């Protein structure tokens, strides 16, 4: 009663059933994982710029 | 594996700098009979019912992770550093030579 | 398992002695003054077979 039976038969069809979802367009706006020193300097710069 | 008996390394205590440390091997302390776990285990064992907790019987490890206990010579602050597994371990053994006959 | 014959012998059921026709227990006379300070004469009236 062998029961390993791996396959990839219908998986592409299942994936395309609902369409392949491309990544959003705001992912490039976040500064997550950016250099800590650069982020610190950016925070200081943003804190001080005079609005008018 | 040979490890020197003295090592200059960062001191996490008051010094907050690199200082000399005497290196020894950490040995597990004797189990106290008034620890909460031992008290609970003894109370559970006492009575009728036989063994109440599993007994491990399938040892597979042939080694242990040696812990070097290093005590700073300036404030006696103590660090513990595990090293990789090794069959043989010695502290301050004879350093290896080069270009010598056997 | 079940009890062995040796274990079963102790309950004294079918393993009791068969003593319907026994003629009595073999015993000397109880110790008393005659036997302690002299002798007493008895007559052997019978010799019989005890099952």
């Amino acid at each position: 009663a062998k029961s390993k039976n791996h396959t990839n038969h219908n998986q592409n069809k299942k994936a395309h059933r609902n369409g392949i979802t491309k990544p959003k367009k705001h992912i490039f706006l976040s500064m997550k994982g950016v250099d800590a020193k650069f982020i610190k300097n950016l925070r200081f710069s943003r804190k001080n710029n005079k609005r008018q | 594996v040979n490890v020197p008996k003295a090592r200059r390394t960062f001191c996490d205590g008051k010094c907050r700098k690199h200082t000399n440390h005497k290196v020894t091997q950490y040995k597990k302390g004797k189990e106290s009979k008034f620890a909460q776990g031992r008290r609970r285990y003894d109370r559970k064992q006492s009575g009728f019912g036989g063994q109440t907790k599993p007994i491990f019987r399938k040892k597979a490890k042939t080694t242990k992770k040696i812990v070097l206990r290093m005590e700073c010579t300036e404030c006696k602050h103590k660090k513990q550093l595990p090293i990789k597994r090794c069959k043989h371990f010695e502290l301050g053994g004879q350093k290896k030579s080069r270009g010598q006959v056997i | 398992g079940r009890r062995i014959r040796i274990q079963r012998k102790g309950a004294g059921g079918i393993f009791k002695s068969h003593n319907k026709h026994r003629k009595g227990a073999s015993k000397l006379r109880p110790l008393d003054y005659a036997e302690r300070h002299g002798y007493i004469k008895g007559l052997v009236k019978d010799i019989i077979h005890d099952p």
Binding site: - | - | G1, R3, I4, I6, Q7
Partner: protein, 42 residues
């Protein structure tokens, strides 16, 4: 019986059992100091 069973009629274990064995196990030569035919006086 402790001796019962087997594809051959054999005891399988020593017939000499200790004095303090349990009621259902004390079968055979109980607390035997020796075994076999007696050669000499005894």
């Amino acid at each position: 019986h402790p001796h019962g069973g087997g594809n051959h009629q054999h005891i399988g274990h020593p017939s000499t059992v200790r004095r303090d064995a349990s009621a259902g196990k004390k079968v055979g030569l109980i607390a035997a100091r020796r075994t076999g035919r007696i050669r000499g006086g005894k």
